[PDB]
Amino acid sequence: MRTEEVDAERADYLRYLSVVRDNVRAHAAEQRAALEWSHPEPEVLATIPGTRRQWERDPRDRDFLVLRAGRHDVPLDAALKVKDTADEIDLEPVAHSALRGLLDVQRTVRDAPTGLDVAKLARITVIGEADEARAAIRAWIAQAVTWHDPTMLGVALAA
Amino acid sequence: DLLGQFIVSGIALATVIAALAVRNRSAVLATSLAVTALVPVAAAFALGVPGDAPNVLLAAAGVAAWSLISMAGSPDDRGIAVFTATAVTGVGVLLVAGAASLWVISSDVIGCALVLLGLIVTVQAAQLSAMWARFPLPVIPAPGDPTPAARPLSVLADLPRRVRVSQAHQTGVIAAGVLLGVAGSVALVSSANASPWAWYIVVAAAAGAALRARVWDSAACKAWLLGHSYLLAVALLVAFVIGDRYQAALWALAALAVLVLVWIVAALNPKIASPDTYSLPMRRMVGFLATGLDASLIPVMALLVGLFSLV
Amino acid sequence: WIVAALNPKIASPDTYSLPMRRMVGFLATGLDASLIPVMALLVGLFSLV
Amino acid sequence: DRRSFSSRTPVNENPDGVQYRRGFVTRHQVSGWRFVMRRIASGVALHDTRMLVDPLRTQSRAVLTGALILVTGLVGCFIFS
Amino acid sequence: VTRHQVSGWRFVMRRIASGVALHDTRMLVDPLRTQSRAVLTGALILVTGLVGCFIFSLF
Amino acid sequence: RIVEDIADAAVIFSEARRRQWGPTHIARGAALALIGLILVGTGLSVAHRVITG
Amino acid sequence: QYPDPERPILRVADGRIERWQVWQPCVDVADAMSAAEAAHIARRLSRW
C-alpha cells in the first residue's frame, strides 16, 4: 500500500488520458476538414464556377446562407462532458492536474474558417475605413452568390 | 620560448571575438568557429601556466567557460553534443586535476576518480538533460485551494525546440560519459603490470557500457555506447606500443579481432540482433546481470584503490 | 543579507525545486541531532567509561 | 466496515477563506514530483511513456546499492579494529 | 485509559502547538515534530554507544 | 499541433529523427570496424619497424 | 443597449473584424478581397 501501487495507478490513468486525447483530436480533424471544404479561401473560388460544385448549397443542408469572413477559434461543437459526481472529494493531484490541463486546450479548434451566417441577422452594418469595408463586403457577397442558385437569393446595390 | 604562448593568446582572443561577432549573420560559420575556438584557448591557459598537473586545471576551466557561454547564446541546434561534452569533460577533469595538483595522488586514485565520474554521469544522463532543457516544471497543487493557472499558449508554442535541444544534450552527455569512462580506464591498467582487480574493473565497465546500450533509443547514443570497448582496445594498443612493450599489443589486436568478428556475424545475420526471437527468461537474466555488474563495481573499486587497507 | 535584500527572488522559498528545498530539511535535521553526542566527546565523558 | 472518512474540502464564502500563505511540501507533493520527473526522464531515453518497466531508476538504485554496501563493509571492518 | 484516549491527547496538544507557532491548523506536515525526534534521537545514539562501550571493556 | 502533456509532447516531437536502429546501422558499424582494424594492424607493424626491428 | 446578436455592429481593423460588445475580436485574421479579383469572378461566372 506504499508509493509503488499509487504510482502504478497514476501511470494507468495517464495512459487512458492519452487515448482520449487522440480520439478527440481525430474529431477535430473531421471538423476542420468539413469547414475547410465548405468555405474555401477567397482565391480558390475563381476556379469553382466551372465544376459541378457551384450551386452545391441547398436549403436542407447545415451550411446554408453562411458567409465566410476569416479564421479564428471555433469552439469544437462536440461535447466533452465528464461525469463528475463528487461533493468536493479530494482527487489525486497529478491526475486531476493533467485532466484539467487537457480540458482547456483541446476544447477549441485552432484557426478555422469562421462563419458570418446571414440566415438570422436581417441587418449588417460595418464601421471603419472605406475600402477595407468594401473588401470584406465584396468578399462574402461573392462567396454567397457563388454557392447558391441565382434563382434562390437576390442582391441589391446603391452607390 | 614564450613567443609560442603570445601567438596562442593572440589567435585565441581573435577567434573568441570573431566567433562572437558573426553569430548574427551566418549562424553556421559562427558555430564552426566556436567549435575550433576551444583548441587554442586550452593551449594558452595551460602552456601559459609555466611548469610540467598544475596547468591543465586552468585549461579545463577555460574550455568549460567557453563551452558554457557559447552553448546558451545559440539557436536550436548545432550547439551539438560537441559543446556539452567538452563542458562536462572539462568540469570532471578540473575536479580531478585540482585534487591531483594541490595534493599528492597515487596515480591510481586518478583512474578510480575518472571511472567513477564516467559511471555517474552516464547513469544520470537523462534527468540532467531535461534539467538543461528548462522544461515547464510541474505544478503539483496542495490539497488546499491554490488552484493554479493554466500554462499560457506561448510556452506551449515553444515546445518542439526544447525537445530537440533535449535530445542533443542527452547524446552529448553520454558522449562525455564514455569519453571519461575510458580516459581513466586507460591510465589504469597500462601503467606497469598492475593488479587483477583493475582487469576486472575495466572489463566490468566495458560490459556495463555495452549492456546499457539496450536502454536508449537514439541511434547515435547506442553507437557511442557500443563503441567504448573498441576505443578502449585501440587506446590500450597504442599506449602499449608507446609503452615499449610489444607483447600484449598483438593481444589487443586479438581482442579487437573478436570484437569485429562478433560485429560481422551480427551484421549479415538478422536473427541474432533481434530481441523478439529470444526468450523472456534470458531477457530477465541479462537485466539481472547488467544490474549485478555496476552493483559490484564500487566495492571492488574501493578494494583495489586500497581504502580497506588504510583501516 | 545584502544580496537577499535587493533581490527579492532568493528570499522567497517558492522559486526553488521541490526536492532541493526537501534536502535542506534533512540538513536541518542532522545538524542539531548530532549536537548532543558531539558534546559528550568534547566534555570527555567517554574517557570515564 | 470501520466507516472511514474520505478526505473532503468545500468552499469558504467569508473573510477567512484566502489567508494562510504557508509553504510546506507535503508527502504527496514530493511523491508526485518524483514520479513526474521519472516519467519525463523516461520519455527522452525510451521514447515511450507507458511506464510499465523503468530501467533508468533501476540503474541509479543499483549504483546506490553499491555505495551503501561499500559503506557497510567499511565500518564492519572498522569494527575489526 | 485506553490508548485511543492517550493517542488522542498527544495529538490535540500538538495541534495546539502548530497553532501558535505555524499559524495553520491543517497539520498536513509538522516540522515541530521532526524538531522533537531529531534532538531526541541524538540522545539515544549517546545512550547506546554508552552501553556499547561499557560492554566494550567487558571482554 | 499543440500538446501539453509533456510526456506525449516529447514522444511526439522527436519523431523527425528516423532514429530507428534497425538492420541498417549495423552494416556501417561492421564495415568501419573492419576498416579501422586493417589500418591499425598495418600501422602497428609500421611503427614496430620505425621504432624497432 | 448591448447590441442584439442580430443586426450587430462590426468594426474592421487591419486584419481583425472586431465585434461590438461593451473588444472580442471575433476574427483574428480577416478574409479580404480585391476589386479586380471580384471583377474576374463575375466575368468567369457569367458563363453558365
PDB file of N, CA, C and O in Angstrom, chain B residues 135-136 151 153 156 159-160 163-164 167 217-220 222-223 226 230 234 237 241 244 246 249 253 256-257 260 263-264 266-267 270 273, chain F residues 1-6 9-11 13-14 16-17 19-21 23 25-27 29-30 32-37 40-41 44 47-48 51-52:
ATOM      1  N   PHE B 135      12.440  22.610 -19.088  1.00  0.00           N
ATOM      2  CA  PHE B 135      11.078  22.252 -19.396  1.00  0.00           C
ATOM      3  C   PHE B 135      10.105  23.062 -18.549  1.00  0.00           C
ATOM      4  O   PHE B 135      10.500  23.744 -17.607  1.00  0.00           O
ATOM      5  N   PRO B 136       8.841  23.007 -18.869  1.00  0.00           N
ATOM      6  CA  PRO B 136       7.832  23.604 -17.995  1.00  0.00           C
ATOM      7  C   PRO B 136       7.574  22.760 -16.763  1.00  0.00           C
ATOM      8  O   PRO B 136       6.707  21.885 -16.790  1.00  0.00           O
ATOM      9  N   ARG B 151      -1.153  26.839 -18.200  1.00  0.00           N
ATOM     10  CA  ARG B 151       0.042  27.345 -18.854  1.00  0.00           C
ATOM     11  C   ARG B 151      -0.343  28.187 -20.063  1.00  0.00           C
ATOM     12  O   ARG B 151      -1.183  27.765 -20.862  1.00  0.00           O
ATOM     13  N   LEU B 153      -0.391  29.973 -23.746  1.00  0.00           N
ATOM     14  CA  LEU B 153      -0.168  29.327 -25.028  1.00  0.00           C
ATOM     15  C   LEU B 153       1.219  29.607 -25.581  1.00  0.00           C
ATOM     16  O   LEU B 153       1.692  28.855 -26.438  1.00  0.00           O
ATOM     17  N   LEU B 156       3.638  26.914 -24.619  1.00  0.00           N
ATOM     18  CA  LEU B 156       3.261  25.680 -25.282  1.00  0.00           C
ATOM     19  C   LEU B 156       3.502  25.750 -26.778  1.00  0.00           C
ATOM     20  O   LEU B 156       3.494  24.721 -27.455  1.00  0.00           O
ATOM     21  N   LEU B 159       7.562  24.533 -27.593  1.00  0.00           N
ATOM     22  CA  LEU B 159       7.992  23.266 -27.018  1.00  0.00           C
ATOM     23  C   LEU B 159       8.795  22.389 -27.977  1.00  0.00           C
ATOM     24  O   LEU B 159       9.738  21.717 -27.513  1.00  0.00           O
ATOM     25  N   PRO B 160       8.492  22.319 -29.276  1.00  0.00           N
ATOM     26  CA  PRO B 160       9.304  21.477 -30.159  1.00  0.00           C
ATOM     27  C   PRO B 160      10.758  21.870 -30.216  1.00  0.00           C
ATOM     28  O   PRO B 160      11.598  20.997 -30.442  1.00  0.00           O
ATOM     29  N   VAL B 163      12.371  20.227 -27.258  1.00  0.00           N
ATOM     30  CA  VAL B 163      12.511  18.776 -27.354  1.00  0.00           C
ATOM     31  C   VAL B 163      13.794  18.395 -28.087  1.00  0.00           C
ATOM     32  O   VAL B 163      14.564  17.540 -27.620  1.00  0.00           O
ATOM     33  N   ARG B 164      14.040  19.000 -29.249  1.00  0.00           N
ATOM     34  CA  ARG B 164      15.275  18.711 -29.966  1.00  0.00           C
ATOM     35  C   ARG B 164      16.486  19.053 -29.119  1.00  0.00           C
ATOM     36  O   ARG B 164      17.474  18.304 -29.102  1.00  0.00           O
ATOM     37  N   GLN B 167      17.167  16.218 -26.805  1.00  0.00           N
ATOM     38  CA  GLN B 167      17.816  15.070 -27.432  1.00  0.00           C
ATOM     39  C   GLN B 167      19.306  15.324 -27.610  1.00  0.00           C
ATOM     40  O   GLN B 167      20.141  14.465 -27.286  1.00  0.00           O
ATOM     41  N   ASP B 217      17.381   4.786 -27.171  1.00  0.00           N
ATOM     42  CA  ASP B 217      16.795   4.551 -28.479  1.00  0.00           C
ATOM     43  C   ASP B 217      17.351   5.423 -29.587  1.00  0.00           C
ATOM     44  O   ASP B 217      17.268   5.025 -30.751  1.00  0.00           O
ATOM     45  N   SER B 218      17.899   6.588 -29.280  1.00  0.00           N
ATOM     46  CA  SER B 218      18.549   7.376 -30.312  1.00  0.00           C
ATOM     47  C   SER B 218      19.777   6.637 -30.816  1.00  0.00           C
ATOM     48  O   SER B 218      20.642   6.240 -30.033  1.00  0.00           O
ATOM     49  N   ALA B 219      19.854   6.451 -32.133  1.00  0.00           N
ATOM     50  CA  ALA B 219      20.892   5.592 -32.690  1.00  0.00           C
ATOM     51  C   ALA B 219      22.295   6.084 -32.360  1.00  0.00           C
ATOM     52  O   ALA B 219      23.180   5.268 -32.080  1.00  0.00           O
ATOM     53  N   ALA B 220      22.523   7.393 -32.381  1.00  0.00           N
ATOM     54  CA  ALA B 220      23.856   7.897 -32.076  1.00  0.00           C
ATOM     55  C   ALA B 220      24.262   7.557 -30.652  1.00  0.00           C
ATOM     56  O   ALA B 220      25.429   7.247 -30.388  1.00  0.00           O
ATOM     57  N   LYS B 222      23.282   4.881 -28.908  1.00  0.00           N
ATOM     58  CA  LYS B 222      23.638   3.469 -28.882  1.00  0.00           C
ATOM     59  C   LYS B 222      25.012   3.240 -29.492  1.00  0.00           C
ATOM     60  O   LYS B 222      25.781   2.401 -29.012  1.00  0.00           O
ATOM     61  N   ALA B 223      25.336   3.970 -30.556  1.00  0.00           N
ATOM     62  CA  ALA B 223      26.656   3.809 -31.150  1.00  0.00           C
ATOM     63  C   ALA B 223      27.742   4.240 -30.186  1.00  0.00           C
ATOM     64  O   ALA B 223      28.728   3.520 -29.993  1.00  0.00           O
ATOM     65  N   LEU B 226      28.108   1.345 -27.574  1.00  0.00           N
ATOM     66  CA  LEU B 226      28.785   0.146 -28.041  1.00  0.00           C
ATOM     67  C   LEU B 226      30.244   0.397 -28.382  1.00  0.00           C
ATOM     68  O   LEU B 226      31.050  -0.531 -28.293  1.00  0.00           O
ATOM     69  N   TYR B 230      35.671  -0.771 -28.081  1.00  0.00           N
ATOM     70  CA  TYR B 230      36.534  -0.613 -29.242  1.00  0.00           C
ATOM     71  C   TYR B 230      37.565   0.486 -29.013  1.00  0.00           C
ATOM     72  O   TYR B 230      38.774   0.275 -29.202  1.00  0.00           O
ATOM     73  N   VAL B 234      41.795   0.145 -28.723  1.00  0.00           N
ATOM     74  CA  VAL B 234      42.797   0.826 -29.538  1.00  0.00           C
ATOM     75  C   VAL B 234      43.701   1.699 -28.674  1.00  0.00           C
ATOM     76  O   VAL B 234      44.918   1.786 -28.909  1.00  0.00           O
ATOM     77  N   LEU B 237      46.202  -0.408 -27.107  1.00  0.00           N
ATOM     78  CA  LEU B 237      47.174  -0.851 -28.096  1.00  0.00           C
ATOM     79  C   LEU B 237      48.282   0.176 -28.273  1.00  0.00           C
ATOM     80  O   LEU B 237      49.476  -0.144 -28.160  1.00  0.00           O
ATOM     81  N   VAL B 241      52.364   0.062 -27.297  1.00  0.00           N
ATOM     82  CA  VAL B 241      53.478   0.269 -28.214  1.00  0.00           C
ATOM     83  C   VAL B 241      54.336   1.436 -27.755  1.00  0.00           C
ATOM     84  O   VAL B 241      55.556   1.309 -27.615  1.00  0.00           O
ATOM     85  N   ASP B 244      56.378   0.699 -25.019  1.00  0.00           N
ATOM     86  CA  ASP B 244      57.605  -0.014 -25.353  1.00  0.00           C
ATOM     87  C   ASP B 244      57.600  -1.417 -24.748  1.00  0.00           C
ATOM     88  O   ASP B 244      58.525  -1.835 -24.053  1.00  0.00           O
ATOM     89  N   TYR B 246      55.455  -4.312 -26.651  1.00  0.00           N
ATOM     90  CA  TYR B 246      55.418  -5.100 -27.879  1.00  0.00           C
ATOM     91  C   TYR B 246      55.049  -6.554 -27.648  1.00  0.00           C
ATOM     92  O   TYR B 246      55.345  -7.403 -28.494  1.00  0.00           O
ATOM     93  N   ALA B 249      50.389  -6.124 -27.231  1.00  0.00           N
ATOM     94  CA  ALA B 249      49.807  -5.419 -28.360  1.00  0.00           C
ATOM     95  C   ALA B 249      49.097  -6.388 -29.294  1.00  0.00           C
ATOM     96  O   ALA B 249      47.920  -6.197 -29.620  1.00  0.00           O
ATOM     97  N   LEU B 253      45.143  -6.655 -30.424  1.00  0.00           N
ATOM     98  CA  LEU B 253      44.650  -6.911 -31.770  1.00  0.00           C
ATOM     99  C   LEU B 253      43.789  -8.163 -31.802  1.00  0.00           C
ATOM    100  O   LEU B 253      42.787  -8.214 -32.518  1.00  0.00           O
ATOM    101  N   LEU B 256      40.408  -7.000 -30.390  1.00  0.00           N
ATOM    102  CA  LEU B 256      39.742  -6.208 -31.417  1.00  0.00           C
ATOM    103  C   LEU B 256      39.223  -7.096 -32.536  1.00  0.00           C
ATOM    104  O   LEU B 256      38.155  -6.837 -33.100  1.00  0.00           O
ATOM    105  N   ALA B 257      39.956  -8.159 -32.848  1.00  0.00           N
ATOM    106  CA  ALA B 257      39.515  -9.094 -33.866  1.00  0.00           C
ATOM    107  C   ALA B 257      38.263  -9.824 -33.426  1.00  0.00           C
ATOM    108  O   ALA B 257      37.345 -10.030 -34.223  1.00  0.00           O
ATOM    109  N   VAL B 260      35.381  -7.342 -33.869  1.00  0.00           N
ATOM    110  CA  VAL B 260      34.883  -7.178 -35.224  1.00  0.00           C
ATOM    111  C   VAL B 260      34.269  -8.465 -35.740  1.00  0.00           C
ATOM    112  O   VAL B 260      33.365  -8.420 -36.571  1.00  0.00           O
ATOM    113  N   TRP B 263      30.855  -8.422 -34.382  1.00  0.00           N
ATOM    114  CA  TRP B 263      30.176  -7.404 -35.168  1.00  0.00           C
ATOM    115  C   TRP B 263      29.716  -7.963 -36.509  1.00  0.00           C
ATOM    116  O   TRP B 263      28.549  -7.815 -36.881  1.00  0.00           O
ATOM    117  N   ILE B 264      30.616  -8.631 -37.234  1.00  0.00           N
ATOM    118  CA  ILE B 264      30.292  -9.148 -38.560  1.00  0.00           C
ATOM    119  C   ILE B 264      29.200 -10.197 -38.475  1.00  0.00           C
ATOM    120  O   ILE B 264      28.162 -10.088 -39.137  1.00  0.00           O
ATOM    121  N   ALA B 266      27.103 -10.579 -36.446  1.00  0.00           N
ATOM    122  CA  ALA B 266      25.843  -9.925 -36.147  1.00  0.00           C
ATOM    123  C   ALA B 266      25.330  -9.129 -37.332  1.00  0.00           C
ATOM    124  O   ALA B 266      24.127  -8.872 -37.425  1.00  0.00           O
ATOM    125  N   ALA B 267      26.218  -8.744 -38.246  1.00  0.00           N
ATOM    126  CA  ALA B 267      25.834  -7.824 -39.309  1.00  0.00           C
ATOM    127  C   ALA B 267      24.968  -8.515 -40.353  1.00  0.00           C
ATOM    128  O   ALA B 267      23.801  -8.159 -40.550  1.00  0.00           O
ATOM    129  N   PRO B 270      20.493 -11.246 -39.525  1.00  0.00           N
ATOM    130  CA  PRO B 270      19.385 -10.559 -38.850  1.00  0.00           C
ATOM    131  C   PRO B 270      18.501 -11.505 -38.046  1.00  0.00           C
ATOM    132  O   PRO B 270      17.275 -11.428 -38.089  1.00  0.00           O
ATOM    133  N   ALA B 273      20.541 -10.162 -33.778  1.00  0.00           N
ATOM    134  CA  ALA B 273      20.286  -8.807 -33.307  1.00  0.00           C
ATOM    135  C   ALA B 273      18.798  -8.538 -33.133  1.00  0.00           C
ATOM    136  O   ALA B 273      18.368  -7.382 -33.129  1.00  0.00           O
TER     137      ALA B 273
ATOM    138  N   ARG F   1       0.532  21.383 -34.390  1.00  0.00           N
ATOM    139  CA  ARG F   1      -0.203  20.857 -33.251  1.00  0.00           C
ATOM    140  C   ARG F   1       0.253  21.499 -31.956  1.00  0.00           C
ATOM    141  O   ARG F   1       1.326  22.096 -31.871  1.00  0.00           O
ATOM    142  N   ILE F   2      -0.591  21.372 -30.940  1.00  0.00           N
ATOM    143  CA  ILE F   2      -0.317  21.882 -29.608  1.00  0.00           C
ATOM    144  C   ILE F   2      -0.606  20.759 -28.634  1.00  0.00           C
ATOM    145  O   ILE F   2      -1.737  20.264 -28.569  1.00  0.00           O
ATOM    146  N   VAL F   3       0.411  20.346 -27.888  1.00  0.00           N
ATOM    147  CA  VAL F   3       0.275  19.325 -26.862  1.00  0.00           C
ATOM    148  C   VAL F   3       0.779  19.900 -25.554  1.00  0.00           C
ATOM    149  O   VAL F   3       1.702  20.719 -25.543  1.00  0.00           O
ATOM    150  N   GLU F   4       0.170  19.475 -24.451  1.00  0.00           N
ATOM    151  CA  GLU F   4       0.525  19.988 -23.139  1.00  0.00           C
ATOM    152  C   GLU F   4       1.062  18.926 -22.197  1.00  0.00           C
ATOM    153  O   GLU F   4       1.856  19.252 -21.312  1.00  0.00           O
ATOM    154  N   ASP F   5       0.665  17.674 -22.366  1.00  0.00           N
ATOM    155  CA  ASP F   5       1.229  16.601 -21.565  1.00  0.00           C
ATOM    156  C   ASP F   5       2.664  16.389 -22.008  1.00  0.00           C
ATOM    157  O   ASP F   5       2.912  15.889 -23.107  1.00  0.00           O
ATOM    158  N   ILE F   6       3.613  16.782 -21.160  1.00  0.00           N
ATOM    159  CA  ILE F   6       5.000  16.822 -21.601  1.00  0.00           C
ATOM    160  C   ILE F   6       5.490  15.443 -22.008  1.00  0.00           C
ATOM    161  O   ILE F   6       6.357  15.324 -22.878  1.00  0.00           O
ATOM    162  N   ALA F   9       4.327  15.260 -25.362  1.00  0.00           N
ATOM    163  CA  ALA F   9       4.967  16.359 -26.059  1.00  0.00           C
ATOM    164  C   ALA F   9       6.425  16.085 -26.347  1.00  0.00           C
ATOM    165  O   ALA F   9       7.029  16.815 -27.132  1.00  0.00           O
ATOM    166  N   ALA F  10       7.008  15.074 -25.722  1.00  0.00           N
ATOM    167  CA  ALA F  10       8.350  14.674 -26.103  1.00  0.00           C
ATOM    168  C   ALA F  10       8.351  13.424 -26.956  1.00  0.00           C
ATOM    169  O   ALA F  10       9.200  13.282 -27.839  1.00  0.00           O
ATOM    170  N   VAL F  11       7.406  12.521 -26.736  1.00  0.00           N
ATOM    171  CA  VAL F  11       7.412  11.325 -27.557  1.00  0.00           C
ATOM    172  C   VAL F  11       6.745  11.585 -28.902  1.00  0.00           C
ATOM    173  O   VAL F  11       6.570  10.662 -29.702  1.00  0.00           O
ATOM    174  N   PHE F  13       7.234  15.039 -30.657  1.00  0.00           N
ATOM    175  CA  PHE F  13       8.054  15.999 -31.376  1.00  0.00           C
ATOM    176  C   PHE F  13       9.478  15.523 -31.585  1.00  0.00           C
ATOM    177  O   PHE F  13      10.319  16.313 -32.018  1.00  0.00           O
ATOM    178  N   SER F  14       9.774  14.266 -31.283  1.00  0.00           N
ATOM    179  CA  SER F  14      11.080  13.689 -31.548  1.00  0.00           C
ATOM    180  C   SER F  14      11.017  12.615 -32.620  1.00  0.00           C
ATOM    181  O   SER F  14      11.938  11.807 -32.741  1.00  0.00           O
ATOM    182  N   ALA F  16      10.789  13.309 -35.863  1.00  0.00           N
ATOM    183  CA  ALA F  16      11.518  13.782 -37.037  1.00  0.00           C
ATOM    184  C   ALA F  16      12.990  13.393 -36.916  1.00  0.00           C
ATOM    185  O   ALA F  16      13.901  14.213 -36.996  1.00  0.00           O
ATOM    186  N   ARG F  17      13.205  12.099 -36.711  1.00  0.00           N
ATOM    187  CA  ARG F  17      14.523  11.629 -36.331  1.00  0.00           C
ATOM    188  C   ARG F  17      14.996  10.397 -37.081  1.00  0.00           C
ATOM    189  O   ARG F  17      16.195  10.113 -37.032  1.00  0.00           O
ATOM    190  N   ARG F  19      15.114   7.681 -36.244  1.00  0.00           N
ATOM    191  CA  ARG F  19      16.031   7.173 -35.239  1.00  0.00           C
ATOM    192  C   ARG F  19      16.076   5.657 -35.182  1.00  0.00           C
ATOM    193  O   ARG F  19      16.934   5.111 -34.479  1.00  0.00           O
ATOM    194  N   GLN F  20      15.189   4.981 -35.904  1.00  0.00           N
ATOM    195  CA  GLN F  20      15.111   3.533 -35.850  1.00  0.00           C
ATOM    196  C   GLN F  20      16.490   2.921 -36.008  1.00  0.00           C
ATOM    197  O   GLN F  20      17.179   3.162 -37.002  1.00  0.00           O
ATOM    198  N   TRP F  21      16.913   2.164 -34.999  1.00  0.00           N
ATOM    199  CA  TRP F  21      18.165   1.431 -35.113  1.00  0.00           C
ATOM    200  C   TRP F  21      18.123   0.500 -36.317  1.00  0.00           C
ATOM    201  O   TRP F  21      18.732   0.778 -37.354  1.00  0.00           O
ATOM    202  N   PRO F  23      18.034  -2.969 -38.923  1.00  0.00           N
ATOM    203  CA  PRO F  23      19.146  -3.714 -39.509  1.00  0.00           C
ATOM    204  C   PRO F  23      19.817  -2.950 -40.627  1.00  0.00           C
ATOM    205  O   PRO F  23      20.019  -3.498 -41.712  1.00  0.00           O
ATOM    206  N   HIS F  25      22.027   0.279 -39.552  1.00  0.00           N
ATOM    207  CA  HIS F  25      23.209   0.897 -38.970  1.00  0.00           C
ATOM    208  C   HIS F  25      24.223  -0.157 -38.582  1.00  0.00           C
ATOM    209  O   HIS F  25      25.422   0.136 -38.476  1.00  0.00           O
ATOM    210  N   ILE F  26      23.751  -1.386 -38.381  1.00  0.00           N
ATOM    211  CA  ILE F  26      24.647  -2.483 -38.073  1.00  0.00           C
ATOM    212  C   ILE F  26      25.659  -2.645 -39.192  1.00  0.00           C
ATOM    213  O   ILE F  26      26.838  -2.943 -38.947  1.00  0.00           O
ATOM    214  N   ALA F  27      25.227  -2.422 -40.428  1.00  0.00           N
ATOM    215  CA  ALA F  27      26.128  -2.567 -41.555  1.00  0.00           C
ATOM    216  C   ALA F  27      27.285  -1.585 -41.472  1.00  0.00           C
ATOM    217  O   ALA F  27      28.450  -1.998 -41.514  1.00  0.00           O
ATOM    218  N   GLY F  29      28.392   0.035 -39.001  1.00  0.00           N
ATOM    219  CA  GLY F  29      29.220  -0.276 -37.851  1.00  0.00           C
ATOM    220  C   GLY F  29      30.229  -1.363 -38.155  1.00  0.00           C
ATOM    221  O   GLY F  29      31.433  -1.192 -37.931  1.00  0.00           O
ATOM    222  N   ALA F  30      29.754  -2.487 -38.686  1.00  0.00           N
ATOM    223  CA  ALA F  30      30.660  -3.575 -39.025  1.00  0.00           C
ATOM    224  C   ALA F  30      31.729  -3.114 -40.001  1.00  0.00           C
ATOM    225  O   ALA F  30      32.920  -3.388 -39.806  1.00  0.00           O
ATOM    226  N   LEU F  32      32.992  -0.096 -40.751  1.00  0.00           N
ATOM    227  CA  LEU F  32      34.025   0.816 -40.282  1.00  0.00           C
ATOM    228  C   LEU F  32      34.895   0.158 -39.226  1.00  0.00           C
ATOM    229  O   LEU F  32      36.093   0.452 -39.143  1.00  0.00           O
ATOM    230  N   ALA F  33      34.327  -0.745 -38.432  1.00  0.00           N
ATOM    231  CA  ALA F  33      35.169  -1.522 -37.535  1.00  0.00           C
ATOM    232  C   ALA F  33      36.231  -2.273 -38.313  1.00  0.00           C
ATOM    233  O   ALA F  33      37.418  -2.224 -37.970  1.00  0.00           O
ATOM    234  N   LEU F  34      35.814  -2.962 -39.373  1.00  0.00           N
ATOM    235  CA  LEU F  34      36.744  -3.732 -40.186  1.00  0.00           C
ATOM    236  C   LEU F  34      37.848  -2.849 -40.746  1.00  0.00           C
ATOM    237  O   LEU F  34      39.035  -3.205 -40.689  1.00  0.00           O
ATOM    238  N   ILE F  35      37.467  -1.695 -41.294  1.00  0.00           N
ATOM    239  CA  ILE F  35      38.448  -0.794 -41.890  1.00  0.00           C
ATOM    240  C   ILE F  35      39.460  -0.338 -40.853  1.00  0.00           C
ATOM    241  O   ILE F  35      40.678  -0.339 -41.098  1.00  0.00           O
ATOM    242  N   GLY F  36      38.974   0.090 -39.689  1.00  0.00           N
ATOM    243  CA  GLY F  36      39.884   0.506 -38.643  1.00  0.00           C
ATOM    244  C   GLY F  36      40.833  -0.602 -38.253  1.00  0.00           C
ATOM    245  O   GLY F  36      42.024  -0.366 -38.055  1.00  0.00           O
ATOM    246  N   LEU F  37      40.321  -1.828 -38.161  1.00  0.00           N
ATOM    247  CA  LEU F  37      41.170  -2.950 -37.788  1.00  0.00           C
ATOM    248  C   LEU F  37      42.306  -3.136 -38.772  1.00  0.00           C
ATOM    249  O   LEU F  37      43.472  -3.266 -38.376  1.00  0.00           O
ATOM    250  N   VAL F  40      44.858  -0.354 -38.569  1.00  0.00           N
ATOM    251  CA  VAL F  40      45.645  -0.253 -37.353  1.00  0.00           C
ATOM    252  C   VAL F  40      46.617  -1.410 -37.252  1.00  0.00           C
ATOM    253  O   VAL F  40      47.717  -1.241 -36.733  1.00  0.00           O
ATOM    254  N   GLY F  41      46.263  -2.586 -37.765  1.00  0.00           N
ATOM    255  CA  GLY F  41      47.250  -3.649 -37.838  1.00  0.00           C
ATOM    256  C   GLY F  41      48.436  -3.247 -38.692  1.00  0.00           C
ATOM    257  O   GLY F  41      49.601  -3.396 -38.283  1.00  0.00           O
ATOM    258  N   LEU F  44      50.440  -0.606 -37.036  1.00  0.00           N
ATOM    259  CA  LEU F  44      51.120  -1.204 -35.903  1.00  0.00           C
ATOM    260  C   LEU F  44      52.452  -1.784 -36.333  1.00  0.00           C
ATOM    261  O   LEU F  44      53.486  -1.501 -35.726  1.00  0.00           O
ATOM    262  N   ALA F  47      54.893   1.233 -37.212  1.00  0.00           N
ATOM    263  CA  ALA F  47      55.606   1.788 -36.067  1.00  0.00           C
ATOM    264  C   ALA F  47      56.548   0.767 -35.454  1.00  0.00           C
ATOM    265  O   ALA F  47      57.638   1.128 -35.000  1.00  0.00           O
ATOM    266  N   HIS F  48      56.153  -0.507 -35.449  1.00  0.00           N
ATOM    267  CA  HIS F  48      57.015  -1.571 -34.961  1.00  0.00           C
ATOM    268  C   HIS F  48      58.358  -1.578 -35.668  1.00  0.00           C
ATOM    269  O   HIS F  48      59.375  -1.946 -35.069  1.00  0.00           O
ATOM    270  N   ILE F  51      60.403   2.033 -35.127  1.00  0.00           N
ATOM    271  CA  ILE F  51      60.921   2.191 -33.773  1.00  0.00           C
ATOM    272  C   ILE F  51      61.739   0.981 -33.326  1.00  0.00           C
ATOM    273  O   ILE F  51      62.569   1.116 -32.413  1.00  0.00           O
ATOM    274  N   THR F  52      61.547  -0.191 -33.947  1.00  0.00           N
ATOM    275  CA  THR F  52      62.325  -1.391 -33.633  1.00  0.00           C
ATOM    276  C   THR F  52      62.700  -2.202 -34.868  1.00  0.00           C
ATOM    277  O   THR F  52      62.577  -1.732 -36.003  1.00  0.00           O
TER     278      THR F  52
END
